Design a binder for this molecule. Structure first.
Ligand SMILES: [Ca+2]
Ligand SMILES: [Ca+2]
Ligand SMILES: [Ca+2]
Ligand SMILES: [Ca+2]
Ligand SMILES: [Ca+2]
Ligand SMILES: [Ca+2]
Lengths: 205, 163
């Protein structure tokens, strides 16, 4: 259809995958579905794939991407652990994650914004390494560490570009200290906002 | 395709993605294109037929037409409508009077055709659109006037008959 894909919501499960596609005609625009996943305390991983965005052309099928909202159980807790460790995205609109157990984000295809929050745990976190594997990723806007601003963000960000070029329009990580860009294919960061950075280290081929 | 009827209420109608036709007639002599009506087409054989005894006055508040290729508007009195907004995906707008004024503005991308019988001292005025066509008969005093506020994307084709 050209009429837009209606919500998708999941609550609970050991691992969640929601895989949208868009198969609309060559001169139309379908805008895809807003996704919400909310883990229960068994939810280790979440994956939310969509069809890549494109501009409606003569022979180009048009797609806009749906917002994604991922939330762990213990996102609002002061003490409870948190279970969502890995999140995989394959295209996205205005995406959010909120997990104090989050270490890895896998990015892919066409994105608008990612906002990463960690759980509102009052305890000072000791492991503060965001692994950010990219592959064919392009961003309209910002990957932000929402937690860093008023709370305890990631101190070291690692970006591993893989098999295809990636472009992050803006990377905002106010508690970041080290930044290591690694791997296999170009990573481009059009604009970083990371005032506390003491070093940047490219190891990428 | 399938055939969908508007009511005197607020309608939320969605086509089959096929040869479907949308009827916006009268019910007890009460108009069926009314405030908040939202219409949606699908595939490219989509027609909206709007017929009213009463003068067409504007598009009514909150009305949105989308994915519908041909819009036919017929009134027992005057037509005044603008279709540069609310309406998207419209290739062809046809407006029909007999014995009263016309004041129409189309979005570019839309082929306007303003047919008027017995025009007499009434004035036709049209604006915008892709190809425009004015077809006026029984004319007398009536001005015919095109693109005074906004030109056509494509061709103008006026024709005017007087007895
Ligand atoms: Ca927080
Ligand atoms: Ca805290
Ligand atoms: Ca801080
Ligand atoms: Ca109605
Ligand atoms: Ca249809
Ligand atoms: Ca259609």
């Amino acid at each position: 259809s050209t009429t837009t894909t209606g919500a998708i919501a999941v609550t609970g499960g050991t691992a969640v995958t929601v895989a949208q596609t868009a198969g609309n005609a060559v001169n139309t625009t379908l805008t895809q579905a807003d996704v919400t996943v909310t883990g229960n305390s068994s939810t280790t991983a979440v994956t939310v794939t969509q069809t890549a965005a494109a501009t409606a052309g003569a022979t180009v099928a048009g797609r806009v991407n749906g917002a994604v909202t991922i939330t762990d159980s213990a996102a609002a807790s002061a003490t409870t652990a948190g279970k969502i460790a890995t999140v995989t995205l394959g295209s996205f609109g205005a995406a959010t994650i909120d997990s104090s157990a989050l270490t890895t984000v896998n990015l892919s295809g066409t994105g608008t914004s990612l906002g990463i929050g960690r759980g509102a745990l009052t305890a000072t976190p000791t492991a503060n390494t965001l692994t950010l594997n990219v592959n064919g990723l392009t961003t309209t806007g910002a990957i932000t560490d929402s937690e860093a601003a008023a709370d305890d963000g990631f101190t070291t960000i690692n970006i591993a570009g893989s098999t295809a070029s990636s472009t992050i329009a803006s990377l905002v990580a106010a508690d970041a200290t080290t930044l290591n860009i690694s791997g296999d294919a170009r990573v481009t960061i059009t604009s970083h906002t990371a005032a506390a950075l003491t070093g940047i280290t490219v190891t990428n081929s | 395709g399938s055939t969908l009827s508007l009511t005197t209420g607020t309608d939320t109608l969605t086509g089959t993605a096929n040869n479907d036709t949308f009827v916006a007639g009268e019910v007890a002599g009460a108009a069926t294109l009314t405030v908040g009506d939202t219409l949606s087409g699908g595939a490219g054989t989509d027609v909206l037929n709007w017929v009213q005894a009463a003068a067409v006055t504007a598009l009514p508040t909150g009305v949105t037409i989308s994915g519908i290729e041909t819009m036919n508007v017929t009134s027992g009195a005057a037509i005044t409508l603008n279709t540069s907004s609310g309406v998207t995906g419209l290739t062809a707008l046809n407006t029909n009077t007999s014995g009263a004024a016309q004041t129409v503005t189309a979005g570019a991308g839309q082929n306007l055709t303003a047919t008027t019988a017995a025009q007499a001292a009434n004035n036709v005025a049209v604006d915008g659109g892709a190809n425009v066509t004015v077809a006026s008969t029984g004319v007398t005093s009536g001005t015919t006037t095109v693109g005074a506020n906004s030109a056509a994307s494509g061709t103008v084709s006026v024709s005017v008959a007087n007895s």
